Amino acid sequence: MFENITAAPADPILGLADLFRADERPGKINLGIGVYKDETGKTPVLTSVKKAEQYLLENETTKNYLGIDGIPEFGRCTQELLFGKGSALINDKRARTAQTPGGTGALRVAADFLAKNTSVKRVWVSNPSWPNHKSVFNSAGLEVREYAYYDAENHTLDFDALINSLNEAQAGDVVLFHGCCHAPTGIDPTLEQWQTLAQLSVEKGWLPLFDFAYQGFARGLEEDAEGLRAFAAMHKELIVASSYSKNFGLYNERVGACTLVAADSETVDRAFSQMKAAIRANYSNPPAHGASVVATILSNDALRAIWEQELTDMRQRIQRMRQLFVNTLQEKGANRDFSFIIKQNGMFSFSGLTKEQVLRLREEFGVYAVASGLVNVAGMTPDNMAPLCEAIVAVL
Amino acid sequence: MFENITAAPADPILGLADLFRADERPGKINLGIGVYKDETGKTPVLTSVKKAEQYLLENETTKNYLGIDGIPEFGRCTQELLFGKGSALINDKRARTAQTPGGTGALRVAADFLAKNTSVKRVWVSNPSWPNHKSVFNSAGLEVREYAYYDAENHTLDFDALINSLNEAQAGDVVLFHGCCHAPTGIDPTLEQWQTLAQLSVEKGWLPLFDFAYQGFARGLEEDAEGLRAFAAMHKELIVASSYSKNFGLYNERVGACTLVAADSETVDRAFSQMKAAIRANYSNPPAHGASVVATILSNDALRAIWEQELTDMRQRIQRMRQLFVNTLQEKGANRDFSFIIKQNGMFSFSGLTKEQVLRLREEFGVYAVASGLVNVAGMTPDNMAPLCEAIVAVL
Ligand SMILES: *Cc1c(COP(=O)(O)O)cnc(C)c1O
Ligand SMILES: *Cc1c(COP(=O)(O)O)cnc(C)c1O
């Protein structure tokens, strides 16, 4: 069967990474990275997870299969993180969490459950969005449509265009929202905008699916959950796909969760059984190690205190690199109003550079960025900031 | 959307497990377990993996994402295990391995790749087979058909019925073969039968998909690969889905692999790119920990020597429990010819018990078995053997 199979393309970041390692120049900077890096250009394993891992090694007596939905405590812990510690959704037991292989894994079991157990045909995604979204929904045969979001020339959330695009969505469509640190723009709705979106959502009958991969990177753990909780307060049903890859630095251990909320415990158990059938037909039951680390940190006060502090250190490093970028550019002098960088949250932002400007940034300076001018702020350090900003001033 | 979603059923083993833990009787025996247990009724973590895990904890500096296909050394190591250390398929680089979440994960990415990149509509599965097979192929929309395999009244491989069922398969269909320790019968083709199957396979144009979950449990690592290598010697293309859950006791770490073989390196790279697109749209990239443990054991002589010995200890425990079962039954006296138990390989066999006999075995004695009379030999110990066999003699 494989003699005229056509080749699949290479995803942008992969391609850039190759071109970067093959770049003989020494002062090269890779801003198209997709992962967090600290002030020394490394993605370390957190001290809290090394300690949780030491512990698991001394206490694990079996590697026997976890249940389809993973470890119960992991479920407890992401529900409290997501919905707040004394939430009505938790006390009325309207929610069920399945441990998945990362946030992508969570999005695919949601897509498979939806495609086979309900009537969704369409999923609405922001323009732009995190790239892999369309492939995940399309593999499940659920059609993807885009709503407007980003105002290119103004570097802002075009809320009017947003609510006006979404009026073409009809009752029974899924609308996907990024919970905080919108990938790739870094522009998030304000809390009032989240509440008018929540109200509009119930009124037109949308099924909200939240992709929550950056909790803790915009303001803090509870602050970042504000919009999701504005929705959960008004919706009988919702799905939230969360990831622990970035806030726990556990990228390759594949730890995420898919949480189903329904009107009552009875209907969420019935729906959840079909979500478990979907997992059973995909990877059977989930990888214990990364989720086990997350569950022992979150349930222990000492370990969780260390983790929270390590996460604010990440958040604050990103926040001073956004500051430093604007300042060193303004100091190196050109016609900047890169001020919008300061108002965006998370590791990503569109710089406003044109694709031929990023092309001579690679060719002439060795600064590597995605052709759309997307830049990962975590690739900037105090040491590479002045070479970076000089290169940007030279191509402007 | 979830208000009239119907409930999914509960998979047999799960149901039996519940009924077993809720059984107040103390001398209860659960033979419907699906996992290996040692002479003390436990599924321990192997000493070789504890040592590999100690090592990973002291040497890992990052949890950054693995490539879509996982860690390269893991790929090296399963290809040599599968095809033999100096294989032509390895030197001509006709094979590509993707690290997957367990053997089930490997079967689903194969199904997704096949469904979307080639013309298979059908997958042939043995009657009977490991239950989850049909759900995996059906989730990918690939129709499943059954070929005859087991001779119920004779407790044997009905080879004639097998080749005669498979003549209804046409060129371009997938035929799934269990590499060794056929689940659930424990009946395997002889090497000559594997070679006539291999010859028939090329002649009618079947695409062979091997499910290899028990390498090392029938005779030894190389012996068990004999049939797959009989096929690989004659086929231009084949897919093998392997699991390390049972032979490394790494069930919940989800470590398996999907290996693609094509006629030349050029066509396997092109086909493999589309298999990577399939993984990218499912869980993105694979869980590092279990695969990392497997790669450091298999590449280190000292650790691999300890592992091989731990695996033969498992294989031999199962082999003396089959012996002991037949002997204690023959000693407890009824009209046994349970001799076929000795000739079956792996942890599973059909006992020949009727469903009402297994029903009074639970009700009256607390011996728990799957309603089809399937029994897991690893649930027998020298200590529970005489209570078990007495109960079986009483219901015969
Ligand atoms: C990182 C990310 C994911 C994927 O999470 P993984 O755990 O890495 O698979 C999903 N959605 C968004 C917006 C993300 O940034
Ligand atoms: C155990 C098994 C699998 C599944 O392997 P996992 O790694 O547990 O998902 C697949 N096929 C057969 C025949 C098996 O026995």
CSV table of N, CA, C and O in Angstrom, one decimal, chain B residues 179-182 186 188 214-221 223-224 311 315-316 318-319 344-347:
chain,number,residue,atom,x,y,z
B,179,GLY,N,1.9,-12.3,17.3
B,179,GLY,CA,3.3,-12.8,17.1
B,179,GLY,C,3.7,-14.0,17.9
B,179,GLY,O,4.4,-14.8,17.5
B,180,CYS,N,3.2,-14.1,19.2
B,180,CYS,CA,3.4,-15.3,20.0
B,180,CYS,C,2.5,-15.1,21.2
B,180,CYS,O,1.9,-14.0,21.4
B,181,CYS,N,2.2,-16.2,21.9
B,181,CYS,CA,1.2,-16.2,23.1
B,181,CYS,C,-0.1,-15.6,22.7
B,181,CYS,O,-0.6,-14.6,23.3
B,182,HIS,N,-0.8,-16.2,21.6
B,182,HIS,CA,-2.0,-15.7,21.1
B,182,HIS,C,-3.0,-15.4,22.2
B,182,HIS,O,-3.4,-16.3,23.0
B,186,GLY,N,-3.7,-19.0,23.7
B,186,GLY,CA,-2.4,-19.4,23.9
B,186,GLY,C,-1.9,-20.4,22.9
B,186,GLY,O,-0.9,-21.0,23.0
B,188,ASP,N,-0.3,-21.0,19.3
B,188,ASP,CA,0.5,-20.3,18.3
B,188,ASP,C,0.7,-21.2,17.1
B,188,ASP,O,0.9,-22.4,17.3
B,214,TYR,N,3.7,-10.0,23.8
B,214,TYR,CA,4.3,-11.0,24.7
B,214,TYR,C,5.6,-11.5,24.3
B,214,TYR,O,5.9,-12.7,24.5
B,215,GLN,N,6.5,-10.8,23.8
B,215,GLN,CA,7.8,-11.3,23.4
B,215,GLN,C,8.6,-11.7,24.6
B,215,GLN,O,8.7,-10.9,25.6
B,216,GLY,N,9.1,-12.9,24.6
B,216,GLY,CA,9.8,-13.4,25.8
B,216,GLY,C,8.9,-14.3,26.6
B,216,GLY,O,9.4,-15.0,27.4
B,217,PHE,N,7.6,-14.3,26.5
B,217,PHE,CA,6.8,-15.2,27.3
B,217,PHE,C,6.5,-16.6,26.8
B,217,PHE,O,6.1,-17.5,27.6
B,218,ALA,N,6.8,-17.0,25.5
B,218,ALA,CA,6.5,-18.4,25.1
B,218,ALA,C,7.8,-19.2,25.3
B,218,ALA,O,7.8,-20.1,26.1
B,219,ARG,N,8.9,-18.9,24.6
B,219,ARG,CA,10.2,-19.6,24.6
B,219,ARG,C,11.4,-18.8,24.9
B,219,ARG,O,12.3,-19.3,25.7
B,220,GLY,N,11.5,-17.6,24.4
B,220,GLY,CA,12.6,-16.7,24.6
B,220,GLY,C,12.4,-15.6,23.7
B,220,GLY,O,11.6,-15.6,22.8
B,221,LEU,N,13.2,-14.5,23.8
B,221,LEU,CA,13.1,-13.3,23.0
B,221,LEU,C,13.2,-13.6,21.5
B,221,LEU,O,12.4,-13.2,20.7
B,223,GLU,N,13.2,-16.6,19.9
B,223,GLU,CA,12.3,-17.7,19.4
B,223,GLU,C,11.0,-17.1,19.1
B,223,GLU,O,10.3,-17.4,18.1
B,224,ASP,N,10.5,-16.3,20.0
B,224,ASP,CA,9.2,-15.7,19.9
B,224,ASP,C,9.0,-14.8,18.6
B,224,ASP,O,7.9,-14.7,18.1
B,311,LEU,N,12.7,-11.7,33.2
B,311,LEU,CA,11.7,-12.1,32.3
B,311,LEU,C,11.7,-13.7,32.2
B,311,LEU,O,10.6,-14.2,32.3
B,315,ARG,N,8.4,-16.2,32.8
B,315,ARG,CA,8.1,-17.2,31.8
B,315,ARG,C,8.0,-18.6,32.5
B,315,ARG,O,7.1,-19.4,32.3
B,316,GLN,N,9.0,-18.9,33.3
B,316,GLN,CA,9.1,-20.2,34.0
B,316,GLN,C,8.1,-20.3,35.1
B,316,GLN,O,7.5,-21.4,35.3
B,318,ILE,N,5.0,-19.1,35.0
B,318,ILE,CA,3.8,-19.4,34.2
B,318,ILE,C,3.8,-20.9,33.8
B,318,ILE,O,2.9,-21.6,34.0
B,319,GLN,N,5.0,-21.3,33.2
B,319,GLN,CA,5.1,-22.7,32.8
B,319,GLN,C,5.0,-23.7,33.9
B,319,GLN,O,4.5,-24.8,33.7
B,344,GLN,N,-0.2,-24.8,25.7
B,344,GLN,CA,-0.5,-23.5,25.4
B,344,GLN,C,0.5,-22.5,26.0
B,344,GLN,O,1.1,-22.9,27.0
B,345,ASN,N,0.8,-21.4,25.4
B,345,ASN,CA,1.8,-20.5,25.8
B,345,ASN,C,1.3,-19.2,26.3
B,345,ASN,O,0.4,-18.6,25.6
B,346,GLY,N,1.8,-18.6,27.4
B,346,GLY,CA,1.4,-17.3,27.8
B,346,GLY,C,0.6,-17.4,29.1
B,346,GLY,O,0.5,-18.4,29.6
B,347,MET,N,0.0,-16.3,29.5
B,347,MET,CA,-0.8,-16.3,30.7
B,347,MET,C,-2.2,-16.8,30.5
B,347,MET,O,-2.9,-17.1,31.5
